[PDB]
Structure 1
Amino acid sequence: VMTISSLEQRTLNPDLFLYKELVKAHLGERAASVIGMLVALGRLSVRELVEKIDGMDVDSVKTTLVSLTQLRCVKYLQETAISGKKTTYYYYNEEGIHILLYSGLIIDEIITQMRVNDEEEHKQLVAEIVQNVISLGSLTVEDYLSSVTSDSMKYTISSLFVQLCEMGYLIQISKLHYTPIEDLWQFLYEKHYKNIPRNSPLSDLKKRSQAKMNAKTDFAKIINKPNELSQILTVDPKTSLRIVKPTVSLTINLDRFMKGRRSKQLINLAKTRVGSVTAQVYKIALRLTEQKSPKIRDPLTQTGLLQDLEEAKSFQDEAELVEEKTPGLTFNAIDLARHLPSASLINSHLKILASSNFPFLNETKPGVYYVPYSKLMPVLKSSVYEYVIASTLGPSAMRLSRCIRDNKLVSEKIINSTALMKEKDIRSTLASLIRYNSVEIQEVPRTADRSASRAVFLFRCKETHSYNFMRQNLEWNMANLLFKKEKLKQENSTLLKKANRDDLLPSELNQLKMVNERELNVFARLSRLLSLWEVFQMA
């Protein structure tokens, strides 16, 4: 019926769907459909692909596979069973194509390092750098700068140079680095039950906890090995100053893009509940401490290991106090009052830190002006969701959905009491909500076994399902919006390549601005939705 329906393209593709359009909208061709198989069908082996895609065996698979790997679009492992030989298993890389999915706000990450050089081709320079770096995947300043012209100013060219370090940009990607975290927890969970020097036969507990402990502490430096090591930072060659190790291949570490994009959201939450001035103080206050907060890195092994009715807590509370403690000494006791506009006498203007009270910050060593951190984010994140259904379901929806938050599993009779309106409204702004999930239902039978009109109903939250009703936001228009970008490319499909290789006509000029402002809208959307989506996937 009319095909403008747009159901096939719509409903039946969750999760996986985003990827195989992204790569399709990005790499495309055969290079895409492989990942579509790879996500959907799980871990997969080189030969086994060809039994399905019909992709001309060991041709596309190999070529497109490495075509992904330098862009790290796959998770990569190889090993052998006890029989012998060897085999390779794969996955869809991490968040992976995610790197592509932003790439614009990764362009915006200039603004942080943008300081000390403003309104320059130096801007355009480092932009050209990064937009070449992600596109080309792994880079080396030796091969890149080598391809870059000679007879210019080396330490002036490199832009980053002494900057390559910062928090973001790049790190060596080393071997098992992008070997999947979950599985390297298994390989490292060897060596411990694997090596038990016949300690005692009794108490597998002494075998167990020690293993996990050994598994934890040995894992610690594993992610910290790439985190920072001076092999990059320290080197200072002859006739020069401190250099990186351009001998090494590096790739953008998205964790400090996680942190960076996120701290902006922590702002826009704070830029509400305080005054714009002290807000700005909070705005730069993160810039110093936005380094060491694990943030989207802290979940880490929260994936891959069975949780516990206890040990899961001993994992939580560990993340609660940790860096608020040791990096707490890296965190803000007395700031430099870095730049600031406020002016004249600037010090008590700084004492305003206490003006932040609820619902975040506002904890310290007793009376040095300071903020909690590793515990902050947990007591911060949980309350980052804010209004996710405002100007979508109507404001009336908030008040009771907010009310359902305070108490729990509450019945509409007393919802009609605490909250208030003619029931004629509740049965809309509530019932209309439940279709979008959130509230769900509790129900209990009364004076019946279980029946139709023989019981009472209660309403609850289950914020998991709530906080999960917005992962449709992934499948939502990040589904459609990206099509919009693609399926319109066919309007000028013959005109596009004409306009690219031409640099005329009335109708050519006619729809240029049309399709273009069109685009700039579709990516404006993508930026907005992206900014919202920045929350629910982690933190």
Structure 2
Amino acid sequence: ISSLEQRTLNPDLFLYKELVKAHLGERAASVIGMLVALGRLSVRELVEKIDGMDVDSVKTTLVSLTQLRCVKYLQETAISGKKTTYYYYNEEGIHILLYSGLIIDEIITQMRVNDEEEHKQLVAEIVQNVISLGSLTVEDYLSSVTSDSMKYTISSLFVQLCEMGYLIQISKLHYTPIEDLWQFLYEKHYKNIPRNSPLSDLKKRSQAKMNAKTDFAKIINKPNELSQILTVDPKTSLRIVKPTVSLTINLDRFMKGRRSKQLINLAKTRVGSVTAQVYKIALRLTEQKSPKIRDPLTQTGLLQDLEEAKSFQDEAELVEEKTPGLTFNAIDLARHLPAELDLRPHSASLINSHLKILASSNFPFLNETKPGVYYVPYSKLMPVLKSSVYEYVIASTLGPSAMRLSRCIRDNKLVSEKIINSTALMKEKDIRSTLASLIRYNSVEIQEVPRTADRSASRAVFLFRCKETHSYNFMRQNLEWNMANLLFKKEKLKQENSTLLKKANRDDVKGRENELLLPSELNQLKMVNERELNVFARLSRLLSLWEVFQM
């Protein structure tokens, strides 16, 4: 009765096999199950691993998974000359299946600042089939609509929404792995050397590297460059979309807007209540030009040495305060500050009054270079954002006393139990219990001393570290397993009530005032689709906690 078979699954294999078995069929899950469980795979390798589908029925799925961006392939060859495609998986093609209810209700809430209209029903409908078809142009969607009063309306909001982000065209860089896109680009700048060049080999290595570093950042921003918007007034409507491009959705602008949703939630518990609203519009303006939640240059390798991580932290702190969009003052907020703020009329001097208070808090919300020019730090706040929410998931679940030790161990950072009860104020068996229920998770390690020759625990005192990444990666996937378990029990419940749901779709297409049935099962259907909507409620609640540690 207790799900113990699922306690032994790889929680990303158990997740990714469930985000496609519910949405796609049970054949797409079998393919992408092997791609997670075996890495890179050919087609002639998948037909030897699956054993239950032949060489063409897997090719039915491969041309459909790439439609939904769930496969990030590569078409490369050996030295003999046979071009063998090694299909991979990608997570962001699966996360759009995971965030799929949040993406629609984000673009609804972001498109309430441009038109007071039913676009919250209408722009939700256009984004509903940019995801369910993955890649599409505009005119095939314009082919299905007939009324030009609405056809011009949807074509207007296409270029309006794509103006401020959320949609870019598809490319091969969307379907090629970043670490293999990097090394081929790294080898463009290696064989371009003069033959028998007198440069030393470490400098020969660095000549290939920093030439490719700005070259790698160039290729990523090529879809971020707005060349798709270039269809300028052929008869009217000074900017519209390009028809011949296949227009997809990006996630790096959504997650960036999703990160900004987290930071206003941190601010509501530390720095006032009305001034956090001022903080909300502040980050909402300087939003699209913000750096990503995760540099794709990190996952290309490049951390074999110590200095390139320092080189990454050079440009990471560079962009948060030396970007022409990301430098703002208290003057610019009132241009987009709406009405009904009621900060007791609004004026930029009182804005700078409540912009000063977002500097003096211990959390680096808004530091400043110039006294009017404020900016939000990202390399300094995001490694303390996740440290704050991790302390309260421990506090909510393991009691509030477990929060006390998890910070007392954090600053003292090699503390022992003789020093705990000096710097804590509980009874010692209560200390030795709530610490014991906290080593079971990776929130603390234990640092032993070998007082004797061997590392004996008889006469030895133990010390207590608090590692960041071991405590986080465990909490990252304790949620990710719980996120996947919850969809497993969703799908198992819908599949055992299949003869109800088949009757609920066929006999009563319209006649649901009586169901053309008995009232002894519509109440039973009521407690199915309530739990079927309550499970996605707990999904979105959990997904906000999970996405913190993704950054």
Closer/same/farther in 2, CA of residues 498 and 324 from structure 1, 3 Å limit: same
How many Å apart are 1:499 and its aligned residue?
A: 1.2
**Counterpart secondary structure, 1:272:** coil
For 1:156 and 1:180, the matched residues in 2 are separated by 37
Taking a change above 3 Å as real, the CA distance of residues 343 and 464 of structure 1, as seen in their structure-2 partners, is closer
Q: Which moved more, 1:81-90 or 1:505-514?
A: 505-514
Structure 2: stretches of 5+ with no match in the other structure: 339-346, 509-516
Measured after TM superposition, the shift of residue 157 of structure 1 is 2.8
Report the more deviating stretch, 359-368 or 83-92: 359-368
Query: Offset at 1:364?
Result: 2.2
2:221 equivalent in structure 1: 224
Between the aligned partners of 1:364 and 1:357, the Cα distance in structure 2 is 18
Q: Distance in 1 between matches of 2:105 and 2:545?
A: 16
Q: CA deviation at 1:352?
A: 5.6
Deviation at 1:346, TM superposition (A): 6.8
* More displaced stretch, 330-339 vs 190-199: 330-339
Q: Is the partner of 2:182 in helix, strand or coil? A: helix
Q: CA deviation at 1:237?
A: 2.1
Q: Tell me if structure 2 keeps the 8 A contact 1:189–1:212.
A: yes
Show CA shifts across 1:432-452 (max 9, x none).
110112111110111443223
Q: CA deviation at 1:166?
A: 3.8
Query: In the superposition, relative to structure 1, how do residues 247 and 356 fare at CA in structure 2: closer, same or farther (>3 Å)?
Result: farther
Deviation string 1:6-51 (CA, Å, 9 cap, x unpaired) is 2112233332110001101111221211100111101000111000
Q: 1:536 to 1:345 in 2, by over 3 A?
A: closer
Q: Distance in 2 between matches of 1:535 and 1:453?
A: 41
CA displacement 1:413-448 (0-9 Å, x = unmatched): 111211232211011100111011211111011144
- Greater shift, 441-450 or 392-401, is seen at 441-450
When structure 1 is superposed on structure 2, of 119-128 and 91-100 the one drifting more is 119-128
Q: Are 1:437 and 1:465, in contact at CA under 8 Å, matched by a contact in 2?
A: yes
Partner-residue secondary structure (3-state), 1:132: helix
Aligned length: 535
Q: Deviations over 1:129-171 (max 9, x none)?
A: 1111101111211111112224444321335233132444211
Query: 1:55·1:61 contact (CA, 8 Å) conserved in 2?
Result: no
CA distance, structure 2, for counterparts of residue 375 and residue 463 of structure 1 = 15
Q: Conserved in 2, the CA contact under 8 Å of 1:324 and 1:373?
A: no
* Conserved 8 A contact 1:117-1:123: no
Q: CA deviation at 1:67?
A: 0.8
Please tell me whether the aligned partners of residues 13 and 475 of structure 1 are also in contact (alpha carbons under 8 angstroms).
Answer: no
- Equivalent in the alignment of 1:466: 471
1:343 aligns with 2:343: no
Structure 1 residues 377, 408: CA separation in 2 closer, same or farther (over 3 Å shift)? closer
Confirm or deny: 8 A CA contact 1:20 1:36 kept in the other structure. Answer: yes
**Structure 2: distance between partners of 1:474 and 1:55:** 33
CA 1:327/1:497 → structure 2, altered by over 3 Å: closer, same or farther?
farther
- The 10-residue stretch of structure 1 (305-314 or 113-122) with the greater mean CA deviation from structure 2: 113-122
* Deviation by residue 1:384-429 (Cα, 9 ceiling, x = unmatched): 6452312111111010111000011211111121123221101110
Query: Cα 1:52–1:85, aligned 2, differ >3 Å: closer, same or farther?
Result: same
Alpha carbons of 1:347 and 1:407: their partners in 2 closer, same or farther (altered >3 Å)?
closer
Q: 1:190 to 1:402 in 2, by over 3 A?
A: same
Aligned identity (percent) is: 100
How far apart in 1 are the matches of 2:41 and 2:351?
61
Shift of 1:320: 1.3
Once the 2 structures are TM-superposed, how far is the Cα of residue 229 of structure 1 from its aligned partner? 2.5
Q: 1:269-326 CA distances to partner (integer Å, 9 max, x unpaired)?
A: 0111111110000011111011111131435434433342222212212211234103
In structure 2, relative to structure 1, the CA distance for the partners of 1:344 and 1:536 (3 Å cut) is closer
Cα distance in 2 for partners of 1:314, 1:294 equals 16
Moved more, 142-151 or 351-360: 351-360
Distance (whole Å) between structure 1 residues aligned to residue 473 and residue 410 of structure 2? 16
RMSD: 2.5
In structure 2, the partner of 1:363 is 368
Matching of residue 497 in structure 1 with residue 505 in structure 2: no
Q: Decide whether the 8 Å contact of 2:178 with 2:299 is kept in 1.
A: no
State the TM-score, normalized to the length of structure 2: 0.91
Alpha carbons 1:22, 1:97 under 8 Å: kept: yes
- Name the CA distance, whole Å, in 1 between partners of 2:308 and 2:350: 51
Task: Give the superposition deviation at 1:202.
Answer: 4.8
Q: 1:41 to 1:474 in 2, by over 3 A?
A: farther
Question: Match for 1:207 among 204, 229, 236?
Answer: 204
Name the CA shift for 1:8/1:381 in 2 (closer, same or farther; >3 Å).
Answer: closer
Contact 2:281/2:333 (CA < 8 Å) preserved in 1? no
Write the deviation string for residues 445-488 of structure 1: whole angstroms up to 9, x where unpaired: 11443223121111101111011121223443212210121111
Question: So what's the TM-score if we normalise by structure 1?
Answer: 0.92
Q: Which moved more, 1:223-232 or 1:182-191?
A: 223-232
Distance 2:452 2:478 in 1: 42
SS in 2 for 1:494: helix
Shift in CA distance, 370/202, structure 1 to aligned 2, threshold 3 Å: closer
TM-aligned CA deviation for residue 333 of structure 1: 5.5
When residues 299 and 184 of structure 1 are mapped into structure 2, their CA distance, relative to the original with a 3 A threshold, is closer
CA-CA distance at 1:369 after TM superposition: 4.3
Give the Å deviation of 1:247: 1.6
- Distance in 2 (CA, whole Å) between partners of 1:357 and 1:7 is 43
Q: Is the 8 A contact 1:333 1:370 kept in 2?
A: no
Contact 2:479–2:546 under 8 Å retained in 1? yes
Deviates more, 1:354-363 or 1:425-434: 354-363
Closer, same or farther: CA 406–199 of 1 in aligned 2, 3 Å: same
Give the drift of 1:232. 2.2
Matched residues in 1 for 2:452 and 2:296: separation?
47
Whether the 8 Å CA contact 1:235–1:245 is kept in 2: the answer is no
When residues 305 and 372 of structure 1 are mapped into structure 2, their CA distance, relative to the original with a 3 A threshold, is closer
**Retained in 1: the 8 A contact 2:76–2:85?**
yes
For the 8 Å contact 2:330–2:373, the answer to whether it is kept is: yes
